Amino acid sequence: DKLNKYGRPLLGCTIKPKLGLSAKNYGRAVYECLRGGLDFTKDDENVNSQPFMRWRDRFLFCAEALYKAQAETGEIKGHYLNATAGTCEDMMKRAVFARELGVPIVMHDYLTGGFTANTTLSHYCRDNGLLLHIHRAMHAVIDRQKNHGMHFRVLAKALRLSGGDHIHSGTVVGKLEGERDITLGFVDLLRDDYTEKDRSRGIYFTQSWVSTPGVLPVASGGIHVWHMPALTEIFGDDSVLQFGGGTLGHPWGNAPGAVANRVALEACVQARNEGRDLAREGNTIIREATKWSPELAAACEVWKEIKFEFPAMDTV
Amino acid sequence: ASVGFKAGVKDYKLTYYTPEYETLDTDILAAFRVSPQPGVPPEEAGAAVAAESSTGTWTTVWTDGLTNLDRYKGRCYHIEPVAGEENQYICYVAYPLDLFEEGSVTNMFTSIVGNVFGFKALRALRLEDLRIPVAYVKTFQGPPHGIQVER
Amino acid sequence: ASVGFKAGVKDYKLTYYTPEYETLDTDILAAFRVSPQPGVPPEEAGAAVAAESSTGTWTTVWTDGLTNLDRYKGRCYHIEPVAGEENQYICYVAYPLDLFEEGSVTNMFTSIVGNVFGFKALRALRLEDLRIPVAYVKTFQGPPHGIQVERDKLNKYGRPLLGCTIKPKLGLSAKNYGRAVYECLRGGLDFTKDDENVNSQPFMRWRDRFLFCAEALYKAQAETGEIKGHYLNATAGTCEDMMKRAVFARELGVPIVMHDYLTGGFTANTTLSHYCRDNGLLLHIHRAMHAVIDRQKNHGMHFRVLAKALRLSGGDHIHSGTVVGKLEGERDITLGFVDLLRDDYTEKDRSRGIYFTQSWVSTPGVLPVASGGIHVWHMPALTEIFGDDSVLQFGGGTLGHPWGNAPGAVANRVALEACVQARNEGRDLAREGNTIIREATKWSPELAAACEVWKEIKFEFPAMDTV
Amino acid sequence: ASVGFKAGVKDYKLTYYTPEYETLDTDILAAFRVSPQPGVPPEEAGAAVAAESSTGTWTTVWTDGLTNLDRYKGRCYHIEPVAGEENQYICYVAYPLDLFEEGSVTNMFTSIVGNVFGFKALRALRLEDLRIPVAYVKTFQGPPHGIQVERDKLNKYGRPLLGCTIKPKLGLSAKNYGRAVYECLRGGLDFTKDDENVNSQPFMRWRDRFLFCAEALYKAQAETGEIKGHYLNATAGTCEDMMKRAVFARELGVPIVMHDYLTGGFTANTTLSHYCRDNGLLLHIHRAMHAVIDRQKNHGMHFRVLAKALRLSGGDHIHSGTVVGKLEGERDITLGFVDLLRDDYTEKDRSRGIYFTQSWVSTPGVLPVASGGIHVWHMPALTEIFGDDSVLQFGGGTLGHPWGNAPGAVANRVALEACVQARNEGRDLAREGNTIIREATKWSPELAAACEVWKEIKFEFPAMDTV
Amino acid sequence: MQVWPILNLKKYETLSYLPPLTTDQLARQVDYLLNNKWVPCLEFETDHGFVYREHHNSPGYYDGRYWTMWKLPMFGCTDPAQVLNELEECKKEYPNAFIRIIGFDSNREVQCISFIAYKPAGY
Amino acid sequence: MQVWPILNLKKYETLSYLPPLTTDQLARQVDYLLNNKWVPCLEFETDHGFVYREHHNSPGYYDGRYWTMWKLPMFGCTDPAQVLNELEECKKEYPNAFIRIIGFDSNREVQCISFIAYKPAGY
Ligand SMILES: O=P(O)(O)OC[C@@H](O)[C@H](O)C(O)(O)COP(=O)(O)O
Ligand SMILES: O=P(O)(O)OC[C@@H](O)[C@H](O)C(O)(O)COP(=O)(O)O
Ligand SMILES: O=P(O)(O)OC[C@@H](O)[C@H](O)C(O)(O)COP(=O)(O)O
Prior knowledge:
Chain B: It is found in: Plastid, Chloroplast. This is part of a larger assembly, with four copies of chain A and two copies of chain E. Chain A is α/β, with parallel strands linked by helices. Chain A has a single domain (1-303), classed as TIM Barrel (Alpha-Beta Barrel), CATH 3.20.20.110. Helix content of chain A is 46%, strand content 11%. Chain A has 13 helices and ten strands. Chain A has helices at 23-35, 55-73, 88-101, 110-113, 115-128, 140-143, 152-162, 180-191, 228-235, 245-248, 254-274, 278-289, 294-303; strands spanning 10-12, 40-42, 78-82, 105-109, 131-135, 166-168, 194-195, 207-208, 216-220, 240-242. The longest helix of chain A has 21 residues, at 254-274. The radius of gyration of chain A is 19 Å and the shape is globular. Chain E has a single domain (1-123), classed as Ribulose 1,5 Bisphosphate Carboxylase/Oxygenase. Chain E has helices at 23-35, 80-93, and strands spanning 39-45, 68-70, 98-105, 110-118. The longest helix of chain E is centred in the C-terminal third of the chain and has 14 residues, at 80-93. The two termini of chain E are 26 Å apart. Chain B binds chain C through residues 25-26, 97-98, 102, 134-139, and chain C through 25-26, 102, 134-139, 361-362. The structure holds D-xylulose-2,2-diol-1,5-bisphosphate (XDP) (3 copies). One D-xylulose-2,2-diol-1,5-bisphosphate sits between chains C (165, 167, 195-196, 287, 319, 321, 327, 371-373, 393-396) and D (52, 57-58, 115).
């Protein structure tokens, strides 16, 4: 309602390389991705404040860039500014400048930052109208193995309670672990008001949320244009699909890279809405679009053969 | 000098396995116990850990050319097989001082331990130790008092 | 093990002259030029400097036994006689990292330079250089922004930055100050500035000045299309007043403030530097009062030490001399500390007066500012000695132009772009300096008139401070 | 009436050498010892100093016409050659009251001492004295309390105050610092103090030190029945940290804090002085780093100028040398600035280096502190040179006593009361000095042992700074 | 290597990056809307076709998000012709307006569909 | 005594106070750029040729500093003809834009060169 976005997943992009870019260069890469059709760009999880780029210079240049892309396209844009920091005091300082710039969204690494600091930021965001994107950095240190640890569904429930508007939830088909059924299981626990017990998906108890709002799941990590039909099919409209290498790795640069992802997605949404089966006609839909989108076409060439298939460690 | 940009995915080992590297006294060093999936060789497994925990991603991006990646990249500089175990190695990774925010244990962990433990290409991963350089230690307050003062 | 305590005074050399010591990478090292009194030997003179600047006193105290002095004592580890001088040596002293408070340039100086220069047993003493260990460098914020960020914010690349000090120093009213500012800025200069002694005085109060200068700078910016700035002086009598001025500059939205770090002090300067980092303000630093400390070769502290101290405490610009202008500054020694201010690593090089290799672990660089008695004919030398990363300031050189400020600014902006184009084309600024300027006078009536006025002005005298 | 504007450089003497000028009672007057380069005449050298330290620059600017320069310009009004020196003069400069910001020692120095010492045309330059007009003196708070109020609060009258610096300078832990403090205080010393470089360091953090020293001082006070104090050092890296430390001292209820005014800075010092006035804290001032500026007779600023600046900015005590100890300080020149620090009016007197008559319009006096290499045998000389209104400090002289701190303190307290009684009885401390001390050793085993240890220690070397 | 255009490239959210919708395609989206049992509604705007910030700059505030309602939501509508019919009537009354079709999910009270159906010339 | 003009005197940073660059002069700056091993890149702007403040007024914030990128930085380029070639292609596609050539020093990550290479008529 605030962003005025309905009817399709939201598209985002992580600026790369993770660390090393200067503040003016970060903003340049942000403006180019946004003007091509992506809804959001974001700081990578480890970009806080470092010798190569201090936070306040980054926030400032990214605001200029996001406002420029918004004026050019006519669509509301956002750039997640990372507020993760070493002390509660520093975290609040960063959130406060984001509020002063008038940007719509901030970001926090809830597990490395901590639940105590996350609850403070969540309350601040509610009080100041800021959307909060959550990263699960460090989760696989706890949830990967099937015999010891805590499963991600427990950490996802804990976040919906503490607070966050988005939460990374895996891609299933990308570079990091995530089985389809178990994933669909906790995606339901994150978005719905009631989920019934269902051991086939690893849900041991029936859970009710008494109208606690739902969290938007974010698929990010090693995904590209050919994965678009699978992603739209597994997650549906209520998700944010992020392409870092998948945008900044396009042969023609960021703007064309963004157009590629935005065209691939609207093609799948139109096809699905028309009745086509994304699971079976996935590649046909993408291939058809390459006929009128030179931008999509070039991206298809680059990643045609990239797949990530290995046995999973965490299974029902 | 700005070698060209060529889109496409390439092995992490080409940029992140650097067995000849001499560690600097300002580097944060890490000892990971890596268990690769069948078919993924130690060097690539280690290079992949060093890559995603510092500056790289899954495919070549043009922006690498706007900086000097050689000075920011984390790098797997030594691999030693684990005695008595099959397909398990201790990979050593060095991270340059400029990658960390001063005084923030939260930032140190977000890079070194943020996403690598969930790679599809690894079966298990364990961080055994970290060498925190004295130049980074000084950016922290440390204990509010410590043993002597407390007694 | 606790050797006994025996009251009484003993030679400092017994505990503080340690020629076999290997310095640690965490040690702060110091190079002192010592001139002992007759009858006091180098080793004792050096040991006495190392002693009183760290842990010892004039007679044996029993408390030394409650600690491990071996780990805290400063120590004279090397002495080298000065060539051509009689009874003058360079004594090197190492101070362990545990002796300094993190992030406090004030504490570093209180130990190393606190009392030793007044010992009855020395005739003169001079601190020439300090090797600040990277472990200590990280406890400082450093410049609020630095060269890269500053160029990025102002959108200025490829040439030195041009500025101008309004004159007369004191005496102008606030509306007149703003009038002179608007005219200089619209002519092509990037910055105008309060002179170092313009704070708040009966003739012009600070808030009226800040306000009128903001109107003037915004007018020149709208007219030219280039980002402009005017350094507003925040130097004041108390920390409270200094912050008040910085806060109004932030409220006006201007890009740069200024501080006199030595007359204001390191404690107040570090506070402003942190404030500037937190509020996006560029900080210009003046070295007013430095020559009272660094002019003479036999006693004092060299400017390179005061330049290092500023890069740590914090500043985005720092006055560094002109070499060719009205105030002292030798070329080689100047190029030496200009490197220590801008680069990340500078190797030991006695020909330039750099006694120790210094690393900065990415602490941003400071932009050197050449100001003081320079004019259009000096432009090629200035562009050649300093390069693109510098700010060249012309006070009398702009307000002294026969046609006024705007034409005065055009003169300096045209002379500089002419040198940048020539250099970029391959020409040798050292040899073709005057030809380049003379050629420009053919199509710039503004430059032409300035050339006529200052053709014969040079400042050449023997230097007091030489390698 | 607006004579025309003519670009070009002209001699400074045409506008700034004004030998006929009669100084106004509101003028700040300065006495500079100028050494010109060969070929530069006194009048021009002096005019150039007066010019750049007030309103002028190196070439004619048109803006001078927008004001009345005659009323703002500083001016060299008198030149007197230095006897026995060749090419050295004392140039007197007068600066109008409107050039200074009220209450800002930082601004006074930025003008008078900002850039002139670095002119290529001068070889050396030294500021010897300043006549601060009573109209400018009233814009300052001055000492937070001053001599009278301090004696009244501590209930101490009739003798100098005794203090002691804990040693080793750095390296002791917080509990050990407090242990050494309690022992010195219970023996009869009025104060103990942090050494100037003890701020907050890995070996001992400030808050732990303040806390343990409070327990120790309160214990010694309960044992003896005399008010005790321990100077807690508030010197720090930022104004914020400095205030934090002052605030905890206020919370503990202790009577005195300390600041290094030159390494901390005048801006930070004025803030602390105001805070101390508002919260009842006595402020002790250290002159760490002064000899880097005031040692040599040909270049720098004399200590009397830095002493005047402190009485204005604010401090209740200020280190002033010992004359007879380990650091430089001639008797006559010392007695000269000690008078400028304590009295309400001091008349011109070149034999003591006082160039101008100075009035203080009731600004309270500052207590001079003699510290540095002194011991029991120096007691008669110290009581004779300084008188009752002074603080005599013995660091090594207390912690170096063979029996420990308490007996070390008794030694100094007995030696001093012996001199006070003798003086009060009519005896001549200069002639009977050693007899008085020797007589006391007959009934004070504590004094006796100290006498044995330091009988032969004297510090006698030629002085660098003489009238 | 093609350079993505800068001028006259305003976009309109969902589906505006695809080639223009033929009338069959349009009809198909309305069918999708009705098949899911969402309520259709049309909105039009003549003055501010794009988001802007005139009255506030705090996070989440933008002007230009609300357009004006054409008639009322078509509760109980089941025939896509009815919807396409209104589109024509609105177009003829407001040929100078941008018009869009939205669909409400009353259960979640979220718009599950929103796409531009007509644009004035020049756009 | 000449009075410095007030109207139509917008400037464009480095080199804009000198007489217009002939094509030889232009080529020479590109050579300087390449000889120093910096990466060239072109940027163009049609709407806001000059800095302005619309979205914020805090210190250091200005709108209009970012222009749009023409293609990609020319990494590994060594022939000035290649650069001048792109200039021509950009000019013909955006005759109405201001276009500038910049050069990156990847080591310091600072632009060591930046100058206007083409201006629309009227300017
Ligand atoms: O989403 P999670 O599973 O938490 O994993 C985290 C990843 O999403 C991570 O943020 C990334 O940086 O590696 C994605 O980059 P890219 O888009 O270039 O792949
Ligand atoms: O730069 P430093 O050596 O600190 O010296 C300081 C000078 O730069 C000083 O600020 C000035 O006012 O005299 C310059 O004026 P002008 O431009 O008219 O010469
Ligand atoms: O007083 P100044 O001339 O400023 O000089 C400073 C000295 O007083 C200094 O504080 C001291 O530590 O060396 C005194 O110690 P000790 O009492 O053991 O000699």
